[PDB]
Ligand binder design. Structure first.
Ligand SMILES: Nc1cccc(C(=O)O)c1
Length: 327
């Protein structure tokens, strides 16, 4: 069967911690006052929750209320514990309170207010400098959560809230996030199609923080090349074929050979034979001002089949692509 894998950084962060930190099942939720918050308008409804703009009437400050659909027990306590563990971290959305919603009878997470604009609204119109600036801000959030033993598992433009006027960013929606435990097998039904790493697409369960770095690479490629999404799969199978048309099939077969993965036979009729394309193939007159040799070298080091080979968040922050960003 498949060969095991371990994260190359922050491997044992949870192993050393007391069970209070990662044993989310045993966590006792401290309930706040639901009457402190007045719902103003519905912002959206996802598969697991309904999000509202609200006002905290105790300070007249705007907040965001996420009312969880009754789905699915353990998933609720996991999100709460992850949010509390990460509270105060750089560019991590701040959980202000947890109240019981009087109508749904489910937990309602109250977050600090962020502008009602996600990164998908802005990321195709940024300058070269702003792509570098906001990528560096996202990396601060990812290194913080990975250093805290947590993988986000749903990095995508909709999960980055941005206040462009104020040049501030927050990584949101920790509902798919999980504690990394070396040797643990995880569910591959995470992340959004276009941001799923090859490990998920080939059903390799012993993945780690590096999944978030593939998803970040997909966002970078979509920004510098002005191509939304970069890997445009029709379904989870064609998603891997779209990746293989760029990265090539030989390195895909080397990845599956290394981890002793048995590729779904559904792929024998659709994968074909593809050579790796040079990143310059995606440059054109409309995106050339966003592309530099440093951007392509950085992207190349994120978009790798082998999850163990990708840059970590901290190594990514060291890359020359960010030397122009003011720190
Ligand atoms: N829309 C919005 C704003 C803030 C947090 C969240 C979230 O799901 O964490 C969602």
């Amino acid at each position: 069967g498949p060969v095991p894998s371990r994260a190359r950084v922050y491997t044992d962060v949870n192993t050393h911690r007391p069970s209070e930190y990662w044993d989310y099942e045993s966590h006792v939720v401290e309930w706040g006052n639901q009457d402190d918050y007045q719902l103003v308008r519905k912002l959206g409804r996802g598969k697991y929750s309904e999000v509202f703009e609200a006002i905290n009437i105790t300070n007249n400050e705007k907040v965001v209320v996420k009312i969880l659909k009754p789905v699915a027990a353990a998933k609720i306590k996991r999100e709460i514990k992850i949010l509390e563990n990460l509270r105060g971290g750089p560019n991590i959305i701040t959980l202000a309170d947890i109240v019981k919603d009087p109508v749904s009878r489910t937990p309602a997470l109250v977050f600090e207010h962020v502008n009602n604009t996600d990164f998908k609204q802005l990321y195709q119109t940024l300058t070269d400098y702003d792509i570098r600036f906001y990528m560096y801000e996202i990396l601060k959030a990812l290194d913080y959560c990975h250093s805290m033993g947590i993988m986000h598992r749903d990095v995508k433009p909709h999960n980055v809230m941005i206040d462009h006027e104020h040049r501030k960013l927050r990584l949101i929606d920790w509902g798919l996030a999980e504690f990394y435990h070396p040797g643990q097998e995880y569910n591959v039904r995470v992340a959004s199609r276009y941001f799923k790493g090859p490990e998920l697409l080939v059903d390799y369960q012993m993945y780690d923080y590096s999944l978030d770095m593939w998803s970040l690479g997909c966002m970078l490629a979509s920004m510098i090349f002005r191509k939304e999404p970069f890997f445009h799969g029709h379904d989870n199978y064609d998603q891997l074929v779209r990746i293989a048309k760029v990265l090539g099939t030989e390195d895909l077969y080397d990845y599956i050979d290394k981890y002793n993965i048995e590729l779904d036979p559904r792929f024998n009729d659709i994968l074909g034979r593809h050579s790796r394309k040079r990143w310059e193939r995606f440059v054109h007159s409309e995106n050339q001002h966003l592309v530099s040799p440093e951007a392509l070298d950085f992207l190349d080091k994120l978009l790798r089949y082998d999850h163990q080979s990708r840059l970590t968040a901290r190594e990514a922050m060291e890359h020359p692509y960010f030397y122009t960003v003011v720190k």
